[PDB]
């Protein structure tokens, strides 16, 4: 009896797969035949074959889903900052205070190369920098670390250690990742959407 019930369940699964294959095949054909015309133009506007505009900017932001590192966010700032700290640990430079970190971030962001970057990404970078500066301030307040750089136990400077070289590397890496995460013009956006929905 148990064997018969198990076989019933197995045959249910098999017939489910059998019907699903054909149904999704037809849906895939319809979706691709409808969506294949669209293309991401060089003015960042998705246009149909006839020239009509479907979107003024793809995805509202213009970022590639294939290079989408986070959970529908271009970067995971914590991971990037940790990787920058580990790759370039500068042992000959002092750590930065909250005010120093904010000042150097504001100085770097106002350069020309960051102007072409989208304002939302700059706001997110500012928010993350403010959060990490608050973390640094909380740690130094907890352990009584002085921003003068003369606290006797130097190991206390290893708690939340950030240096201007690391800040510059992190900002340049984030800007480069954002620039390289944009839709390359001419990409077959519609076919990608059709396949990524049908599969």
């Amino acid at each position: 009896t148990e064997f018969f019930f198990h076989t019933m369940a197995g045959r249910e699964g098999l017939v489910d797969t059998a019907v699903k294959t054909a149904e999704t095949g037809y849906m895939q054909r319809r979706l691709v035949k409808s969506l294949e015309d669209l293309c991401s133009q060089y003015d960042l506007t998705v246009r149909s074959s006839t020239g009509d505009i479907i979107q003024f900017i793809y995805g509202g932001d213009g970022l590639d889903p294939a290079a989408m590192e986070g959970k529908d966010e271009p970067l995971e700032f914590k991971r990037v900052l940790d990787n920058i700290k580990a790759v370039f640990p500068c042992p000959s430079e002092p750590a930065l205070s909250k005010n120093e970190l904010i000042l150097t971030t504001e100085s770097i962001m106002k350069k020309s190369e960051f102007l072409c970057c989208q304002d939302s990404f700059l706001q997110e970078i500012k928010k993350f920098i403010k959060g990490v500066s608050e973390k640094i301030k909380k740690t130094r307040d907890k352990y009584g670390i002085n921003d003068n750089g003369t606290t006797e136990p130097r190991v206390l400077y290893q708690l939340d250690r950030i240096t201007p070289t690391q800040v510059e590397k992190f900002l340049e890496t984030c800007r480069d990742k954002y620039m390289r995460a944009q839709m390359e013009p001419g990409s077959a956006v519609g076919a990608l959407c059709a396949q990524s929905i049908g599969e």
Binding site: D43, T45, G51, D52, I53, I54, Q55, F56, I57, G60, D61, D72, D119, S120, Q123, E124
Partner: protein, 209 residues
């Protein structure tokens, strides 16, 4: 009755105030912010209230554009509005020299009356609104994004920025509930501010056609 009906009338009046304020017509903040108690003070019962005349509005003038330009709001008492009522309203608008009017029907408009309202006159603009639609403000709904009608200069700037033509913009039907809410004509452009998942906003544009 006499409690839900007066509540519906008050909320219809408040939605009309919000719609007129959004269209640019002159309404005082007291009209925009009217509690139910003040409406009861104006009229506290269904037989006391007169739908055809006690609620009609003619103080609606587009103060931003021209105070001389006038807008009118009608509340026909019959659930279905016939040809004769439309004729009476049109001749009254002729008497007071008013070209823009809204008609808040109670249940519906007869197809002959609808067709007549379509071809009353290009000069006499009248818009049919069901009370059921006006019981809730469309703009206040969370799904509906922010719509702003753009001027001709802004439309020209938008077309010049993308090297575009008018017909290439995404379309929006004239009979759309938002379009009828703002009373936009064919050829006008509406900027839509979609709220993004992040703190940013996505700006798009639609052409009425």
């Amino acid at each position: 009755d006499d409690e839900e009906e007066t509540y519906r009338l008050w909320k219809i009046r408040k939605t009309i105030m919000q719609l007129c304020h959004d269209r640019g017509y002159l309404v005082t903040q007291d009209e925009l912010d009217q509690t139910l108690e003040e409406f009861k003070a104006q009229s506290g019962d269904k037989p006391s209230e007169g739908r055809p005349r006690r609620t009609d509005l003619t103080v609606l003038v587009a103060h931003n554009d021209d105070p001389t330009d006038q807008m009118f709001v009608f509340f026909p008492e019959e659930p279905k509005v016939g040809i004769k009522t439309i004729k009476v309203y049109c001749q009254r608008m002729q008497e007071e020299n008013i070209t823009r009017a809204l008609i808040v029907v109670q249940q519906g408009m007869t197809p002959s009356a609808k067709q007549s309202l379509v071809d009353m006159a290009p000069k006499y603009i009248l818009e049919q609104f069901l009370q059921q639609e006006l019981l809730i403000n469309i703009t206040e709904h969370e799904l509906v994004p922010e719509h702003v009608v753009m001027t001709k200069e802004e439309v020209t700037e938008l077309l010049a920025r993308y090297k575009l033509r008018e017909n290439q913009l995404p379309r929006i039907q004239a009979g759309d509930p938002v379009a009828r809410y703002f009373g936009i004509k064919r050829g006008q452009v509406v900027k839509i501010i979609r709220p993004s998942e992040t703190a940013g906003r996505y700006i798009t544009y639609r052409l009425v056609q």
